[PDB]
C-alpha cells in the first residue's frame, strides 16, 4: 500500500505485459487506472474487468499514443471524466530489431515515432493538465537498452535514450509547479540469466512496482531520475 | 504502507537528522528499529520512547560504526535478541570539509575510516547474517558529492563514491542468496536552493521513504542501484 | 600532431562553428576532409580555399544529412572518389528551443529528424562502408543537453541523448571488424560562465581535437564511450 | 607526437605495466619523464636506460605513493631538479582479491591507503607545485572496476570508485587555476573473459597510456573532471 495524494492515472499500451501489470499493481493500490488500447478492446475489457470484479477502479480508452491529436483528445475526455489527471505513465512502444546494415530509416521511424514521440505527446499533455493543480507525477517506460546500447536494437536504443533524457528537460519544466518526471530502465522481464546476479527474469510486476513507487507521494524528492530494475543486470 | 518481510533493522548514526527520520518511517511501516548511536544516549532514547509511545518497535544500541569488534558484536547482539537481522542501512557518517591544500593526511582518513570503512563493515556482516536467511537488503545512505564531486570536499566525495562502488560489489556477492545492496544519493537536505529544480531542500522524510522503498519487497529486482534523492539538482 | 591509420574523414554540417573547427583540426593532421554544406556554397567553398592555400587536402560536399538518398549517394561518392572512407564525423544538427507546451509534433520531430536520424543514417552507412577493410572510427557530436536535460530542450535532449544511446549500439555492431563509434558532449562552445569551473566558454578547437583523439589511432581501445567536453560543467 | 606545453610529469609505480608504458610514451612525446618505484630499483632503472638510450629524458626516484612525507619530499625534490612539476599520474594500485566474508578490514584498508589515499596525496601536491605557474594537468588512474563494482572487490571497487568522486573534487579545486583532474577506468589489461569485451580482445597498456597522454596533453584543454573510459567496450 503506497501512498498517492492523487486519484487517477493513465496508462499508455497497458492491454498486456508491464502496462497491464503497472494497471493491476496501481489498481489495487487505490488509484483509478485508464488503460489505453490501439486497436482491439478484447484484451483491455478483459483487464477492466478483472480489475472491477476486484473491487477496483479502472476504465479503458481507445488513442494510438503515438498521434498528437489522438493522445490530446485523450487527456481532454479523461480530464472532462475525471476533473483532472494526476499521473501519466508512458509504457506504449515497439520493437522492430534488425542489424542496422539492414535496416531501412522507415524501421528507424517505427520505432521513434512509436517510443519517444508518443512520450513526448503525453508529457507535453501531462504538463498542460497538472500544471493548473500544481501536482503531478509522470514515469518513462525506459529500458536498460537505452542506458547500455544493444547488438541489433539501433533504434530501440535511440528511441529509449533519447526518452531518458527528454524525461530530465521535463523534469525542470515542471519542477516550480511540483510535477515530477522520472524513468525506469527495466532489464530483462519475463542463457539471459548467466549475466543477472539475481539470476532470474524480473516480474512485470517488480517493473510495476518501481513504477508505483515514482508515482506515489514517498519519490516526492525525486525527479530527473532513472531508476534501475534489472537485478544487477547493469549497475 | 509498504510491505516488508523481514522483520527488524539496524540504523546506524541514527540519533537525529536523516538517521532518525529513516528509524520513524521504519518504524511506522511494523518494522523493529535498531537506533545506534556511539556516545551519549539521551536523543536517541528520547527517539525510542517517541516511537514506543505510537505504538511501533524501537530499541537503541551503542557501538561505534567506525570499529570493527564494536560493529561485529552488535550485530551478534542484536541476532540474539531478535532471532536475525533483514535490514541494515549504513547511515553513519562525519564531514571535515577543508580545501585540499589545507588538508592533512590524517583529515581524509577521518572522513574515509568514519564513512566507508564504517559501511564496509556493516556490508560484511549483513552478509555473514543474511546469508543463512537467504533473505535481506542493505542500504548505503551515498550523497550527491559522492557523484558529482565539490569544492573543499575531496575527502568527503572519496567516501561516498567509493561507498557507491562498494556497494555495487557486495550487490554482486548478495545476489545469489537474494541479499540486495542499493545506495541512496541525498542533496540538499534540510543561493544553493535556486540551484535545485524543485525550489526546495529536501525533507528527511523524502530520503527515509526512499531508503524504505529499497529495503522493501516492491524493490525486490533492484539491486546495485544508486537512487538519486536530490530534487532535480543532478540528473 | 596525433596518428592517423585511415586516410580521410568526411564531417557532416562543416560549413561554420564546430563542423568547421573539426576539418581544419583534421586536415591539418594530414586527413583529407570533405566538408559537407547543405545549402549555400560559399561559406563552404571558402573553408576549402583556406584548408587548400594552407597546402593540406579538402573538399566540399553538398547533401543534406536528414535526407537518406543524399547522404547514402554523398559517402558512395567519396568511396567513389577516395576509395573508400575511414573515418566519419556526424555533427550536423539543429535547434529549435520551445517550452513543451509550445512545442508541436512538427517542432519535436524537426530536431529529431534533422539531429538523431540523421546521425543514424551516416553510422549504418560508415558500417557498410568501413567493414571490408576492417578498419574505422565514427564520431558522433552530441551534447551536455543529452546528458543532463534542458528546460526548453526537450527536442534537443531527446535527439543528443537518443544519439548518445544509439552510438553504443553501433559500437556493439562495429567492434568485431574494429570499427569504433564514440560520443562527444560538448558543454558551452563560443561558436555555438559562472558554473563552468574552467570560467570560460570551451573553443570549438577543444572540441575538434577531442574529436581527432577519438577518431585517431590513440583511442584504438575506446568504443561505445561519451567523452564530455564541457569544462567541468558536468561530472 | 600530442602537444605539451608542460615539460615534466611523475609517474607514480611505473616500473612495470601500465604506469611502465605511460612513461615509455610520454617520454617518446618529449617530457621528461620521473619513473616512481617503491622498492625495486632494477626495473626501473633498467626502463630508465632503456629510455635515455632511445634519446629521451628520464629519470628514477623512489618514495612511497602511501607515505604523505615520502610522497611530499619526493615533490620538492623534482621541484628542487627540474624548476616545476608540470603533470603527475597517480598509477600507484594493489589488488586483495577476496569474498567479503573472508576479508578483513585490515585488506580493504591496505587496499584504500595504497590506491586511494596515495592519489589524494598526489593530487594535493600537485594542486600545491602547478598552482603558482597556474597551469597543470594530473590524471588518475582509476578502473572499470570503480565503475561498475566486481565480485570478490569490495575492497578495491571502493578504492576506486573512490578515486573517480575525489579527483572530481579536485577538478574544481583547480580549475580557476587552470590545474585540471581527469580519470581514466581501464578494462581488462594484458599483464573466456575476452566474451564480453566487444572488441574481442584485451586491451594493451600502450592504449591506456595514449588515453593518459591525452588528458595530460593540451588537446584535452577544455576537460576536467571527466572520466574516459578505455575497455574495448566492455563498459558502456
Given at each position: 500500500?503506497?501512498?498517492?495524494?492523487?486519484?487517477?492515472?493513465?496508462?499508455?499500451?497497458?492491454?498486456?505485459?508491464?502496462?497491464?501489470?503497472?494497471?493491476?499493481?496501481?489498481?489495487?493500490?487505490?488509484?483509478?487506472?485508464?488503460?489505453?488500447?490501439?486497436?482491439?478492446?478484447?484484451?483491455?475489457?478483459?483487464?477492466?474487468?478483472?480489475?472491477?470484479?476486484?473491487?477496483?477502479?479502472?476504465?479503458?480508452?481507445?488513442?494510438?499514443?503515438?498521434?498528437?491529436?489522438?493522445?490530446?483528445?485523450?487527456?481532454?475526455?479523461?480530464?472532462?471524466?475525471?476533473?483532472?489527471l494526476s499521473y501519466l505513465v508512458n509504457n506504449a512502444?515497439?520493437?522492430?530489431?534488425?542489424?542496422?546494415?539492414?535496416?531501412?530509416?522507415?524501421?528507424?521511424?517505427?520505432?521513434?515515432?512509436?517510443?519517444?514521440?508518443?512520450?513526448?505527446?503525453?508529457?507535453?499533455?501531462?504538463?498542460?493538465?497538472?500544471?493548473?493543480?500544481?501536482?503531478?507525477?509522470?514515469?518513462?517506460?525506459?529500458?536498460?537498452?537505452?542506458?547500455?546500447?544493444?547488438?541489433?536494437?539501433?533504434?530501440?536504443?535511440?528511441?529509449?535514450?533519447?526518452?531518458?533524457?527528454?524525461?530530465?528537460?521535463?523534469?525542470?519544466?515542471?519542477?516550480?509547479?511540483?510535477?515530477?518526471?522520472?524513468?525506469?530502465?527495466?532489464?530483462?522481464?519475463?542463457?539471459?540469466?548467466?549475466?543477472?546476479?539475481?539470476?532470474?527474469?524480473?516480474?512485470?510486476?517488480?517493473?510495476?512496482?518501481?513504477?508505483?513507487?515514482?508515482?506515489?507521494?514517498?519519490?516526492?524528492?525525486?525527479?530527473?531520475?532513472?531508476?534501475?530494475?534489472?537485478?544487477?543486470?547493469?549497475?
Open positions: 500500500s503506497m501512498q498517492f495524494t492523487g486519484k487517477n492515472v493513465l496508462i499508455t499500451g497497458a492491454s498486456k505485459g508491464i502496462g497491464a501489470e503497472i494497471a493491476r499493481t496501481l489498481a489495487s493500490m487505490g488509484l483509478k487506472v485508464w488503460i489505453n488500447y490501439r486497436s482491439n478492446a478484447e484484451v483491455a475489457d478483459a483487464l477492466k474487468n478483472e480489475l472491477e470484479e476486484k473491487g477496483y477502479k479502472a476504465a479503458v480508452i481507445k488513442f494510438d499514443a503515438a498521434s498528437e491529436s489522438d493522445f490530446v483528445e485523450a487527456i481532454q475526455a479523461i480530464v472532462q471524466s475525471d476533473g483532472g512502444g515497439v520493437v522492430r530489431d534488425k542489424l542496422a546494415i539492414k535496416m531501412k530509416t522507415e524501421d528507424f521511424h517505427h520505432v521513434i515515432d512509436n517510443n519517444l514521440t508518443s512520450a513526448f505527446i503525453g508529457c507535453r499533455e501531462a504538463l498542460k493538465v497538472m500544471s493548473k493543480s500544481r501536482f503531478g507525477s509522470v514515469v518513462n517506460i525506459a529500458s536498460i537498452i537505452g542506458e547500455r546500447g544493444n547488438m541489433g536494437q539501433t533504434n530501440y536504443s535511440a528511441s529509449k535514450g533519447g526518452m531518458i533524457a527528454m524525461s530530465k528537460s521535463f523534469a525542470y519544466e515542471g519542477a516550480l509547479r511540483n510535477i515530477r518526471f522520472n524513468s525506469v530502465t527495466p532489464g530483462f522481464i519475463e542463457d539471459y540469466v548467466k549475466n543477472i546476479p539475481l539470476n532470474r527474469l524480473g516480474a512485470a510486476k517488480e517493473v510495476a512496482e518501481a513504477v508505483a513507487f515514482l508515482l506515489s507521494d514517498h519519490s516526492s524528492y525525486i525527479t530527473g531520475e532513472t531508476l534501475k530494475v534489472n537485478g544487477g543486470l547493469y549497475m
